[PDB]
């Protein structure tokens, strides 16, 4: 039951109660997960009078690689419990690479309760600084239309998709946020790139009522407001004629869009007029809806260079930094939304998990043991280690964060991060060069439509015999099937190495399948990543996924705008 004042107070109290809820959380995680095999070798039984000391002393810091082979076991046929505990409802992935190899993490139900508590507070506090209509809606470029399964018949999954797919969230979203313009089906539309300009449609529809434009980052807004560039008829011409534009080829989104289409000629006059009358599209967003109190998302560190554009799009409209945290971990939420992107700072949430930070102080690295989150000195930057119900215990994330100050008894952290990573020899390659070359050489074919590809990826499926490769393609614009079929061929044709060739010619591994995905999906993979509990930087994305990456996977299956196998061979 959402309410402004009582939620503040509850969170006011627990942030001030930081030490008790931090120590109780670790204990309540250990209570729930006292039987972890990882824990077993370490030698924990729970309870005791030194549990936290035992936790630090009897358990070692851990990297992605030795935890990979573990959580691999969960997904590949053996649906068994591992680092965390019971069989996971689905599996995470991380930016960067685990030994040049795909990353792995599990999620649980409690962090869904965490979803509901955390938006309530962030949204409550923002709404105190920027109150909102109860009967208004919200233009949010947010999408979760795609769901995949592991070889074991177990969904492996992303933040976006799972949260929205989970049963409690539409019921739990009603009173803390503005009802989405976009049907869930167009959010759940098999074609995002098509649905995305339709999402634009959607958010603009009730513009006087909408309280904000929202993306997790400026780039999406930018993308979208650079898609404000990149769409605007279709909508007008297709909303005009009461018939959706023929660019849209999908029945589900076609039926939904169709039920709301009748022929209106006066409005074109209006929508049109405003739009070519102004300078630079300075203030895109206030122009769309004057009424929006603020612009929302994460504008700090690496999205900082994308802020000018947003600002250019945003005009005088205030830019609000969004909270920080994710499927692996949630740490900080903004209870001071008014604060600018440049002065943006973030407040660690206390009951989400147990967090230890490794100091970088000496030169590089310097040898120092982990200290309490409250013990972290103000002004100094520590590497982030995160313990939580996602199943990582004393796991180092590889990111540097800065302590700006303290909200009562709780610490604040800020992000100037770039990429918290080092590379290792990859296993999904077919060098990135090749894969980047692969995408580049085949993309030229879609370039005759003069449309350029924003991002890409690849997959190996060892469930099927022969195992078959999967490429994921993210381009700004729609096109026919023949050309994507051709592109799939070139991807095979673009990987220049000898060994690729001997086997797909021998077909022990299936014809590389190019599954064209819709625009903004890999952007979505920036969306949960910079947002990812750690320190801002999380921006290197592994280009091809073995059965060792799973967040990207959930994304991959259901929004196959086009799904095809090479006609050659």
């Amino acid at each position: 039951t959402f309410d402004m004042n009582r939620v503040i107070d509850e969170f006011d109290e627990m942030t001030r109660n930081a030490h008790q809820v931090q120590k109780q959380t670790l204990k309540e995680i250990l209570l729930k997960n006292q039987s972890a095999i990882y824990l077993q070798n370490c030698g924990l039984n729970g309870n005791a009078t030194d549990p936290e000391e035992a936790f630090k002393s009897m358990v070692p810091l851990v990297t992605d690689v030795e935890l990979e082979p573990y959580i691999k076991r969960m997904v590949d046929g053996d649906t068994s419990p591992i680092l965390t505990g019971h069989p996971v409802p689905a599996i995470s992935l991380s930016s960067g690479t685990s030994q040049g190899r795909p990353k792995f993490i599990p999620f649980t139900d409690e962090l869904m309760e965490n979803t509901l508590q955390l938006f309530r507070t962030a949204f409550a506090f923002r709404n105190r600084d920027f109150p909102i209509d109860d009967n208004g809606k919200a233009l949010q470029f947010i999408f979760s239309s795609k769901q995949y399964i592991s070889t074991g018949g177990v969904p492996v999954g992303t933040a976006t998709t799972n949260v929205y797919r989970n049963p409690n969230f539409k019921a739990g979203m009603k009173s803390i946020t503005s009802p989405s313009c976009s049907p869930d089906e167009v959010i759940f539309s098999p074609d995002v790139h098509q649905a995305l300009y339709c999402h634009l449609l959607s958010g603009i529809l009730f513009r006087d009522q909408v309280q904000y434009v929202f993306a997790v980052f400026a780039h999406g807004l930018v993308h979208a407001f650079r898609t404000f560039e990149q769409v605007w008829e279709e909508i007008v011409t297709d909303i005009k004629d009461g018939v959706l534009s023929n660019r849209i080829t999908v029945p589900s989104v076609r039926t939904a869009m169709s039920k709301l289409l009748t022929p209106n000629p006066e409005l074109a006059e209006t929508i049109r007029t405003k739009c070519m009358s102004l300078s630079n599209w300075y203030g895109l967003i206030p122009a769309l809806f004057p009424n929006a109190k603020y612009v929302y998302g994460i504008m700090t560190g690496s999205m900082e260079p994308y802020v000018p554009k947003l600002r250019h799009y945003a005009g005088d409209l205030p830019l609000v930094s969004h909270d920080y945290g994710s499927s692996e971990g949630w740490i900080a939420a903004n209870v001071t939304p008014r604060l600018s992107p440049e002065e943006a700072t973030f407040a660690v949430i206390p009951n989400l998990g147990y967090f230890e930070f490794l100091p970088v102080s000496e030169t590089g690295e310097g040898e120092e043991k982990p200290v309490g989150l409250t013990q972290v000195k103000i002004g100094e930057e520590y590497e982030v280690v995160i313990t939580n119900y996602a199943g990582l215990y004393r796991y180092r994330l590889g990111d540097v964060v800065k302590v700006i100050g303290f909200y009562n008894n709780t610490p604040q952290l800020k992000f100037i991060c770039r990429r918290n990573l080092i590379l290792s020899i990859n296993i999904d390659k077919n060098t990135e060069r090749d894969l980047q070359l692969s995408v580049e050489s085949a993309a030229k074919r879609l370039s005759e439509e003069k449309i350029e590809v924003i991002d890409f990826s690849s997959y190996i499926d060892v469930s099927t015999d022969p195992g078959h490769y999967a490429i994921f393609w993210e381009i700004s614009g729609e096109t026919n099937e023949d050309v994507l079929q051709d592109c799939c061929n070139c991807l095979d044709r673009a990987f220049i190495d000898a060994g690729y060739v001997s086997s797909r010619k021998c077909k022990t591994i299936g014809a590389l399948e190019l599954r064209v995905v819709a625009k903004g999906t890999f952007r979505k993979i920036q969306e949960h990543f910079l947002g990812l509990g750690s320190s801002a930087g999380q921006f290197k994305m592994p280009r091809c996924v073995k059965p060792s990456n799973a967040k990207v996977l959930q994304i991959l299956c259901e929004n196959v705008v086009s799904s095809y196998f090479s006609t050659a061979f």
Partner: protein
């Protein structure tokens, strides 16, 4: 060698079987027929006549959970089913007790009753199973850093997980992936592998219970 008098379809008997196989202590299995029960079962259990009874040192222990609790402490040298702390074991007995009444009551209605009892048993079972899931949250084994006291106790119902699916019309995987697949982990262990009878035989037995019992 300890002798265990066991009913192959009885779930409690499997738990004693799992216990002795988990430890690595050899035993002789004895199949009891309710029709002509052995002199020992009647001699060991004069009133209650209930499997599985274990006789160790010429001293017969009764109840399966008891077999388990007795079994843990009478050989505590290699495998600890329970945590060292008294309170961790507080959840132990409580959770054994949980699964033993409510869970056993729900499921027995599912494979052993018809009409509203099925329906009541369904929602009850699904809720029970949910409660385990939600309370346990993210735990590989119930009872401690290795295999646990209530893992064993709950793992016996894994054999009956598919008879419960088929009779109840509900997938225990679909609403609660974790518990059904917590059952698949334990299957890899030789304890659950060799102390847990095949799915097909017990479902016929439960199905036979339907034909046999009106």
């Amino acid at each position: 060698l300890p002798i265990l008098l066991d009913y192959w379809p009885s779930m409690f008997g499997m738990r004693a079987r799992v216990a002795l196989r988990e430890k690595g202590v050899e035993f002789e299995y004895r199949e009891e027929d309710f029709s002509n029960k052995s002199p020992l079962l009647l001699q060991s259990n004069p009133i209650h006549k209930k499997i599985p009874v274990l006789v160790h040192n010429g001293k017969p222990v009764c109840e399966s959970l008891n077999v388990v609790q007795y079994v843990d402490e009478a050989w505590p040298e290699k495998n600890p089913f329970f945590p060292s702390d008294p309170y961790g074991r507080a959840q132990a007995r409580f959770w054994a007790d949980f699964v033993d009444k409510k869970f056993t009551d729900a499921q027995f209605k599912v494979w052993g009753k018809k009409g509203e009892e099925q329906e009541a048993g369904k929602k009850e079972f699904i809720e029970a199973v949910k409660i385990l899931e939600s309370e346990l949250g993210d735990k590989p084994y119930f009872g401690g850093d290795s295999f646990g006291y209530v893992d064993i106790s709950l793992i016996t119902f894994s054999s009956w997980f598919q008879a419960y699916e088929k009779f109840g019309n509900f997938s225990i995987e679909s609403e609660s992936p974790k518990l059904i697949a917590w059952a698949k982990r334990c299957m890899e262990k030789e304890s659950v592998s060799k102390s847990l009878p095949d799915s097909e035989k017990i479902v016929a037995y439960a199905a036979e219970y339907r034909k046999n019992n009106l």
